Design a protein around this ligand. Sequence first.
Ligand code: HEM
Ligand code: HEM
Ligand code: HEM
Ligand SMILES: [Fe+2]
Ligand SMILES: [Fe+2]
Ligand SMILES: [Fe+2]
Ligand SMILES: [Fe+2]
Ligand SMILES: [Fe+2]
Ligand SMILES: [Fe+2]
Ligand SMILES: [Fe+2]
Ligand SMILES: [Fe+2]
Ligand SMILES: [Fe+2]
Ligand SMILES: [Fe+2]
Ligand SMILES: [Fe+2]
Ligand SMILES: [Fe+2]
Ligand SMILES: [Fe+2]
Ligand SMILES: [Fe+2]
Ligand SMILES: [Fe+2]
Ligand SMILES: [Fe+2]
Ligand SMILES: [Fe+2]
Ligand SMILES: [Fe+2]
Ligand SMILES: [Fe+2]
Ligand SMILES: [Fe+2]
Ligand SMILES: [Fe+2]
Ligand SMILES: [Fe+2]
Ligand SMILES: [Fe+2]
Ligand SMILES: [Fe+2]
Ligand SMILES: [Fe+2]
Ligand SMILES: [Fe+2]
Ligand SMILES: [Fe+2]
Ligand SMILES: [Fe+2]
Ligand SMILES: [Fe+2]
Ligand SMILES: [Fe+2]
Ligand SMILES: [Fe+2]
Ligand SMILES: [Fe+2]
Ligand SMILES: [Fe+2]
Ligand SMILES: [Fe+2]
Ligand SMILES: [Fe+2]
Ligand SMILES: [Fe+2]
Ligand SMILES: [K+]
Lengths: 156, 154, 154, 155, 155, 155, 154
Amino acid sequence: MKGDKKVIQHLNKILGNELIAINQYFLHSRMWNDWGLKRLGAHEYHESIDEMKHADKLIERILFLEGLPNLQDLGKLLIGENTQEMLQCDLNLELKATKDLREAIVHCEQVHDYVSRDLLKDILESEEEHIDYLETQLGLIQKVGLELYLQSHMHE
Amino acid sequence: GDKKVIQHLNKILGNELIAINQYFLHSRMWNDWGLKRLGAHEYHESIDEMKHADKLIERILFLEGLPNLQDLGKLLIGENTQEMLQCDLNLELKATKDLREAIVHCEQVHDYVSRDLLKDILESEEEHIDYLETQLGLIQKVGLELYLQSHMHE
Amino acid sequence: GDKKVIQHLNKILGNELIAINQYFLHSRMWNDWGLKRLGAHEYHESIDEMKHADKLIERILFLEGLPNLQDLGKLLIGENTQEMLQCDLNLELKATKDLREAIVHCEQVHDYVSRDLLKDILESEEEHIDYLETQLGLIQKVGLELYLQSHMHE
Amino acid sequence: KGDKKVIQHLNKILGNELIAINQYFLHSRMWNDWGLKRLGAHEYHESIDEMKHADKLIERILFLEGLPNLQDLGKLLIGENTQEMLQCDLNLELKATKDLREAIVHCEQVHDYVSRDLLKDILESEEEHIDYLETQLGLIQKVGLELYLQSHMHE
Amino acid sequence: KGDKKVIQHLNKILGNELIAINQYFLHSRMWNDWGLKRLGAHEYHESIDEMKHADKLIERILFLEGLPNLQDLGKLLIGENTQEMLQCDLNLELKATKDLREAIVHCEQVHDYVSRDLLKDILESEEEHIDYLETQLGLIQKVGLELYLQSHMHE
Amino acid sequence: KGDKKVIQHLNKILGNELIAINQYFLHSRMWNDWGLKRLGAHEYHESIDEMKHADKLIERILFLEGLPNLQDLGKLLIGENTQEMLQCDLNLELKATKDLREAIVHCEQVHDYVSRDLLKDILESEEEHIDYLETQLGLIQKVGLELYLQSHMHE
Amino acid sequence: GDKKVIQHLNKILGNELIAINQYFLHSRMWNDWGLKRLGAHEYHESIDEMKHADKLIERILFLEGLPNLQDLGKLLIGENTQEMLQCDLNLELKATKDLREAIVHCEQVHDYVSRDLLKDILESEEEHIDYLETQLGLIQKVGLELYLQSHMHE
Ligand code: HEM
Ligand code: HEM
Ligand code: HEM
Ligand SMILES: [Fe+2]
Ligand SMILES: [Fe+2]
Ligand SMILES: [Fe+2]
Ligand SMILES: [Fe+2]
Ligand SMILES: [Fe+2]
Ligand SMILES: [Fe+2]
Ligand SMILES: [Fe+2]
Ligand SMILES: [Fe+2]
Ligand SMILES: [Fe+2]
Ligand SMILES: [Fe+2]
Ligand SMILES: [Fe+2]
Ligand SMILES: [Fe+2]
Ligand SMILES: [Fe+2]
Ligand SMILES: [Fe+2]
Ligand SMILES: [Fe+2]
Ligand SMILES: [Fe+2]
Ligand SMILES: [Fe+2]
Ligand SMILES: [Fe+2]
Ligand SMILES: [Fe+2]
Ligand SMILES: [Fe+2]
Ligand SMILES: [Fe+2]
Ligand SMILES: [Fe+2]
Ligand SMILES: [Fe+2]
Ligand SMILES: [Fe+2]
Ligand SMILES: [Fe+2]
Ligand SMILES: [Fe+2]
Ligand SMILES: [Fe+2]
Ligand SMILES: [Fe+2]
Ligand SMILES: [Fe+2]
Ligand SMILES: [Fe+2]
Ligand SMILES: [Fe+2]
Ligand SMILES: [Fe+2]
Ligand SMILES: [Fe+2]
Ligand SMILES: [Fe+2]
Ligand SMILES: [Fe+2]
Ligand SMILES: [Fe+2]
Ligand SMILES: [K+]
């Protein structure tokens, strides 16, 4: 059973996005920890872990479909230099990720690879949860102010 | 923090980032082939490199450096079990060479805490070399097929 | 219920009924030969198809159709381990082709609950394909006798 | 018998520990008196950490047949508000790590590797303390003094 | 805000505690170094007792709006052997109880009854230490030094 | 793979461990035979400690593709009474640590930092053993031989 | 204590001291090679000989002799698994010959407690011989590579 060439290419594209997010969120997590914003650092670590698990599932699916997972190409990390920029960078990355996920799902439907579609939909649900988290945090910065938002995320 | 020590630390970090991906892919390849014992052990090697990367990142930030997670070097991906193990060994031998050079520099500028971190990583890499050389020796002693059979089931 | 959806569900059900019997017989043949790990695994494949058949029967009755448990198609029975595994693989590949055609039809008439049921079965069949292709690949990598030895004891 | 200059170095490190014990203990109780109990508890634990380092150095000096010096207490850097107290602690820690590096150099030179390893363990702990202090000073810059204090009022 | 002379007295008692902490800690580690572990353990516990007294005095001084003095460390009385060490501790304790009685008199004079009660609790503890020390010196006389040391080798 | 002279050093340290295993095991069983059971038990644990060191050295030598030498057994220093046995153990330990320091120098020179760390760990344990031995000899001087023996008759 | 009995006991002790070191090194060789089941079993054989040595030392001291731990005879170190097992067997057969001669002498001078100790040691050596002859028999019956495969994993 060789999967569809274009589906495998789509899955490798989603994998590439996951690989960017893993590193981006891990660095942001450790930056927040370095700054003593430990609640932010812990949450961002868990975001990184979630992307690691997505990457794993994509790697497994690609190999089952007799494709070659691409872990060599690492795209541009969007690294902020303060809390507001870092969150916005994560949100920008997530919005790119979901655009790619939708185009991949379209392709899966068109060639009847419904299992790959379901996997991508599961990932998409998790990325929209991440967008929900990010948009809410940026909203909280507007509502309570940056300094109070940072204070709320100093201690776990 | 010393700028050349931070360069070294970022170099070691770069080596960890390659190993993470190389071992993770090799792990999932072995799993796809039904060599589940190899796949599980290789996954655990990958996790070990993730932990090393984490400590390096934390140290670089403490020393007010910028950790480099952007530049991913060349993955050494084998096409069968014998090549995969040799690729891992080739990577590890390069990693320990770089570790030794980084330790020298830490000693020279009296960064004894960075040296101790790198020595802990180096002991872990030498355990990995021990594992890899042992597996390649077993392939010579029992043959490839028996070695694979012995790593089919967990 | 849509008439052509019910026909598709009854076709998938027919595929499950073939699979139940083929896998159950293959299981008991392996147990008779003393290849108990294969017999146990094949027994669980048969049970999985039984559960799919149950879910299809229940769906057909909900949609006010008549489940067809009377028509049993051709069992693909092998005479040795390699043929049996390939017979199972050939049956699964036909099964996945019918499931995709049934899903296309469910989407067309907006029977999204039937589509979801068929998608869940499809994921289970692709896991069975993954298992079967892996086993055939292991036979190539370690040879038939070692593969059989590996599946003698549970 | 130990190397005489190694024992001198160990007694110098011990002297730094003795300053830090008292400085941190007083800062802790000042923060407790002011009702900044989270700062007070954390600083108490810094003081205890230095007490344990002092103990290990005393034991090592005695094993090497030296005389531990608990008599000469150097200058305590006592701040008058939270920002100064943290800065005082950081100033003390930086002097402490400099002395530790010079002691390790000397241990290495005379092949006293066990003393080196003891001082390296202490150095790891002092750098963790520097990490804590630099982080707190950075937090004061990022959220402001009053929020930083409020966050350290209750345990 | 407390009486200026009461605060001075409390700082004087605190100064005696800080000498005692360091003298007893060193003596404890000297006895451990010699393999007289029962003496070492007991002397360690005496040192901890003084640390806890010092803490209470610091807290009381800060409450009374005084400045605790952890900077001034008086003369440690370090012995060269078990008998001298025990006598050194006893000499220090007798000086300490003298200063405590004078501080209590002053607390009474100015109606600082809470500071008085704190100092009386500390004094009770010091007289228990004196009881311990005088009893050990008497055991050395009754069984001999070598038997006394043997009895305190193993915990 | 491993440095030829590093392997030589490791085999030298291993040789010293092999002497110590047998010397301490025999001293233990002599003390047991004499009814000095506390001495015999402690000396047994010293022997066990040396066995674990030898094991680690053997494993490291094999990893580095050297040939561990368990064939060459140097001179056991067997005493005739408790004081001589302790001094024989101390003489052996002091030769052991001298060799360990020379091996660490050589590991450092050729960047075998993992072998250095292993040898430093062994060195720390030998210095603990020296601490024990020097303390026992000091106790014999402080309380006398007969009381020292009495204290080590019963576990 | 009979002077000739003590000489015999010191001879047995000397055999134990060779065996401790030979089995301990063979154990760590097998571990280095990744034959962990062999390595663990050989470790336990080494420990068994340590315990025999201890009992002999205690008996000698009770009989007012001097235990000789200074003279270490020739270790028979093999270069591969079959050689190592044959080296162990050669040592054991020699050990049992000396044990039988020591027992003869104990019986002759009526040292029945020493005899009973040596008989206990001898029963253990004959069990070791049973193990070694069996392993060499297995190498003949299934072949070296399968024998090795069977002792890779604990
Ligand atoms: C910058 C690169 C990475 C870093 C720093 C990193 C770090 C970590 C850390 C610290 C853990 C927790 C390990 C533990 O303590 O148990 C972890 C877990 C894990 N990592 Fe990574 N990782 C990285 C990249 C990756 C990649 C590229 C993959 C896969 C393609 C991956 C897959 C996983 C998986 C599957 C887990 C277990 C998660 C779970 O089941 O909870 N990681 N990683
Ligand atoms: C101003 C001087 C000091 C004060 C106020 C002080 C206070 C304290 C306090 C409150 C404790 C906790 C005791 C307990 O609750 O059991 C303690 C423990 C301890 N102290 Fe001090 N101390 C001082 C100086 C020292 C010095 C100079 C040393 C050694 C050279 C030392 C060694 C120790 C040790 C080893 C502990 C036990 C820590 C543990 O294992 O948890 N202290 N001290
Ligand atoms: C190359 C020489 C030797 C090596 C590497 C060695 C190694 C070891 C090791 C690793 C252990 C287990 C220790 C633990 O983990 O607690 C042990 C136990 C022991 N050793 Fe040795 N050993 C050696 C020689 C000897 C000798 C020469 C004797 C006595 C004459 C001896 C007597 C014992 C005894 C009685 C035990 C405890 C066994 C038990 O009760 O299970 N060993 N040895
Ligand atoms: Fe994701
Ligand atoms: Fe597409
Ligand atoms: Fe799904
Ligand atoms: Fe995400
Ligand atoms: Fe939050
Ligand atoms: Fe690593
Ligand atoms: Fe360099
Ligand atoms: Fe460390
Ligand atoms: Fe590694
Ligand atoms: Fe099915
Ligand atoms: Fe249709
Ligand atoms: Fe569903
Ligand atoms: Fe199926
Ligand atoms: Fe299997
Ligand atoms: Fe098993
Ligand atoms: Fe310290
Ligand atoms: Fe110096
Ligand atoms: Fe250490
Ligand atoms: Fe500190
Ligand atoms: Fe905090
Ligand atoms: Fe007191
Ligand atoms: Fe007064
Ligand atoms: Fe009271
Ligand atoms: Fe007292
Ligand atoms: Fe007593
Ligand atoms: Fe003792
Ligand atoms: Fe040793
Ligand atoms: Fe050398
Ligand atoms: Fe280590
Ligand atoms: Fe030792
Ligand atoms: Fe034996
Ligand atoms: Fe005879
Ligand atoms: Fe018996
Ligand atoms: Fe044996
Ligand atoms: Fe076996
Ligand atoms: Fe294995
Ligand atoms: K607030």
